[PDB]
């Protein structure tokens, strides 16, 4: 009946760090996927399991608009069966992922000539991320064999690094505002519909 | 958790912090060089002091991961380059003396001035007061004045400093386990742990001398031919079997003979190819110059210039009030930001240099995937030679004809090719004995073979025997004539210029063979050859992650530096020189002197 708050996930003033990927569970509203274009310099719309062409034909039990920021090089990592710092330790997608990936260059917003250190990723983690997990833990990461005692230092590196998006950066290092649209499909009434 | 895995993680944190800080140091240096003001000066000092302090810190945390227990050569190469101590190994007092002497010498040279003898009010800096006399004047005593005064005013002051410079630089090397400072400098070419591609530091001296042996006959003919023409323009002064006086060589020292083209041109009636005038008629600007350069690299299969490159680079002098350092430089700031700072005029020289500096950018873009510590040329001599081969192809009559700067009605005869080759040989071949002898003298000074009271005596002995160049005025051991050159009194290794020369002709000969060029090597244009660009690229993308010997083999098919392509390029001039020197003496004598 009411419009799904895609304006929220796709036009929010601030998105998220990828390590704390923010999900807006979508339900009982009307989905109008054609609106999804903000006239951005580098737009990607890969979809898996579902068909992006005429995406406003399929009901789902839920839609999970996971939003974050990463640099351009790592955008490809937001995809099934990928590897690298993002998908390994920050935000993994499953093998048979059934949804969509929508990213766009945001150097206009999230860069600063002094450097925007607000957006973080997770440089080290002890075990690879099970699909759609989130590790918001600041556990001082023990790389060596002596316990780290919750204080950083030798082989005790802090597990989160900043990006420092400056505007003079390159396309593969500029901030890119990713929006995953995980389409859940359970036995439930599947209230997420709409042409 | 082994120690190789701790080093693997230590380098991972480093690679992300180092990329961030080096980006601030590069962007602070870029803002200074593009806008020079006293406020920009201050920030280049701050970011450059934070980056110098972060590197200094990280080295100590790295010495805890022993290189022996690390087996992945990529990790070893990063730690080895990070574990460098340098000045640090010296006491906090000696590490402060050395930094003072290096600062004082660099200021004595750059600010070094000599004033007219007749007019003690009129003084001249080396650039552009004395360098201007050396290049363009054709008097004898006016050249002898500037050549002597520079070495007697600037050089004599540097002499006590260079003696202490040698002593401390050795103690730095002997505490990083090198034999001497020269051995420390030769560590740039060293390779260990890769069987079949290893390269010892001592091997460089064998290579450099053995290769220079093959250069000798060409140089002896270029020297004899140059001497004969010089003997006809300075009749009473130059002997037909003696060395060339050091001040008649085109510049302050004789590093390049390029300025002697006016007096040595074989067929001075036939003009030189100067597309400068054609660029003005077609309304070319700097935008077009780099676009035509960007076109050249696309044609061989290399990627176009980054969108940031056009937005942030400085392709013209901003002029007016915003001043800048106009020395052409390519900037790899990192994080995808590439930039060229060139005060371009619409001339042919800048057209070719834009190709040369953009070659540096293409090299930098290529290995941009590599880890931070491995983003560099395979050795020192790679990076310059990758840019030089760009200006080799771009300046050919073929490329000029294919871009519409040279009309297809212009015809190349065997005489303009001889004019072309000789102007190259004055620049290229002429610097090889100068470069090899200078780095030989410094190498022998550091090893201790030349005592202090024989410094200037062994210098001018070796200048006669190797370079075939004689001083016009005798010098005692209060001079330091090497120190009168920038690269000597400013602590820069010099053999890179010899190795770079031989590298570039190895590349160009290999790239043209892949491009199926037919004819002499000096006529070749690698344009449109994607096979050539591919061959070059698979070395460009390696960076420092491979031994330079493997990098050299991925282009030219040989593991070692060779001189034959250099000879092959210059052969048409060589057999012609063997003709013009038919009834002239080939060789020189080391005991003649214009000072009796
Ligand atoms: C740089 O200096 C460090 C510190 O001096 C060197 O590492 C030390 O070497 C001494 C040699 O007597 C050992 O006793 C120490 O255990 C070492 N470690 C530390 C933390 O001091 C390091 O070898 C030097 N690097 C190079 C390349 O010379
Ligand atoms: C999203 O925000 C931009 C900038 O504020 C605005 O131009 C655009 O109209 C917005 N789009 C929607 C659908 O609200
Ligand atoms: C060394 O490390 C790199 C990067 O992790 C890896 O690709 C390479 O395979 C390693 N070396 C060997 C011999 O496997
Ligand atoms: C660059 O130099 C000019 C001098 O004309 C100065 O006015 C300007 O402020 C400088 N740039 C910046 C970003 O301040
Ligand atoms: Zn260069």
Residue numbers in the entry:
A (entry chain B): 333 to 527
B (entry chain A): 19 to 614
Paper quotes:
Receptor binding is a key step for SARS-CoV-2 infection.
The phylogenetic analysis showed that BF.7 could evolve from BA.5 and gained an extra R346T substitution. BQ.1 (KD = 19.07 ± 4.08 nM), BQ.1.1 (KD = 14.70 ± 0.37 nM) and BF.7 (KD = 13.37 ± 0.29 nM) S proteins to hACE2 are comparable to that of BA.4/5 (KD = 14.37 ± 0.41 nM). Based on the ACE2/RBD structures of these sub-variants and a comparison with the known complex structures, we found that R346T substitution in the RBD enhanced ACE2 binding upon an interaction with the residue R493, but not Q493, via a mechanism involving long-range conformation changes. From the structures, we found that it is R493 but not Q493 that is regulated by R346T substitution through long-range conformation alterations.
